[PDB]
Design a protein around this ligand. Structure first.
Ligand SMILES: [Zn+2]
Ligand SMILES: [Zn+2]
Ligand SMILES: [Zn+2]
Lengths: 173, 174, 171
């Protein structure tokens, strides 16, 4: 029938208008989402141990897990963010327009700057500060290059996931 | 209770005979599967923005995500393919008897050679062409070694053949 | 309404007292867990092809998959173990007080020693023997350092102890 929505320690999720929640999504406790968000199949927004704040027009893709460290870390996601399939976001701040590649893990006290890209499968170490409009890739996630301003977010994403950009020398997704 | 099956843009999943769908699997939109397939716990096949085509005796293991790019990529998976636990396949072509290792990410316009093996946890970048009968590994995935065609088509077929037996213990209540 | 729990070939899950099973967890076949365990959202314990044995006060976090190889590998998980979000455990032994970091893959015949830690996102190759009180990281996962045995056990104990408290907020 509908997404699993659930109170914990008296906190009840607050979801804005025009938000799509998949039938088998889970949103639990201290979670606020803005307007125009989508939460896809089997995604889990677990606000049991600390707070999750999500802005407007955020896409949380299938099988993604959002969690925090009890009294140590929080999630703040800004507007127009894309969180890829099977991503783990743990106690991270993600600024407006940032894209997190499918399969990535983003650890606590990470800041992803406005319009930055985390490549698919990256592991972003605790406390990593990702500059606005940069691409990070690998395990651990390292600076690859500035986002090309002459191209769109999506094409910058596609270029960041092409083997041509990591050829014979650079060994990071 | 059974699998979440839904249409999107009027496309309705089509499933061959003798196909196991776990009751918490999700199959949505433009998905076509052959017969002898198995779709495991919390697998998601999301054909909402482009097409997913799957041959026979394919297992999609627990927590695996199949998705595509709007007007840009499609998924084509051959027969006797094993897709591991928590794998993401995005707009890729997987030929017969290929095995995708658990936790791997396979990106758009990738072609996985017949009898090939993507190692657990690999990230295969866009327009990687994986040689048949070869093992790829790492992030980005790179050529590690050849396997004999004999042991590699047979070996990957046996994983897919046993998976049909594991499916029937749930599907047929055996 | 509640967790998917099912027999396969006559093997029926056995769950200890005081154990939290999330409404969308899956526990199937030859699985035994002890007391004070928590299985979180969309976790899958698939005991269809071989045994899964889990001791007391173990948390299996959201999205994690536990499976085996038919006739070939088993899962044995000791007491006070924390298994991170979106982890895959395939046919591995995890000893008391061990942590598996989120996003990690742990393959068949791996042994994770008492009080050892697998870093987030590691891939532990088939057969890797992880020393007690050691940190392994990377893909393939490699030795990083020793940790003090008494500190590692008490820290990892307190992570498993907090998880039992988080579980009690959902009961
Ligand atoms: Zn967590
Ligand atoms: Zn996608
Ligand atoms: Zn398996």
């Amino acid at each position: 029938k509908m997404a699993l929505i659930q109170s914990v320690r008296g906190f009840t999720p607050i979801i804005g208008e025009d938000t799509f929640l998949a039938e088998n999504a889970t949103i639990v406790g201290d979670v606020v989402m803005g307007k125009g968000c989508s939460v896809w199949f089997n995604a889990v927004l677990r606000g049991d141990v600390n707070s999750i704040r999500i802005g407007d027009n955020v896409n949380i893709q299938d099988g993604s897990i959002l969690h925090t460290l009890y009294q140590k870390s929080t999630i703040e996601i800004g507007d127009n963010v894309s969180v890829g399939h099977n991503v783990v976001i743990h106690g991270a701040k993600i600024c407006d327009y940032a894209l997190i590649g499918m399969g990535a893990v983003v650890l606590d006290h990470v800041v992803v700057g406005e319009g930055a890209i985390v490549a698919a499968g990256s592991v972003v170490l605790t406390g990593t500060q990702i500059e606005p409009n940069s691409i990070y890739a690998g395990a651990p996630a390292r600076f690859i290059k500035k986002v090309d301003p002459e191209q769109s977010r999506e094409m910058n994403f596609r270029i960041a996931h092409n083997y041509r950009m990591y050829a014979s020398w650079f060994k990071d997704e």
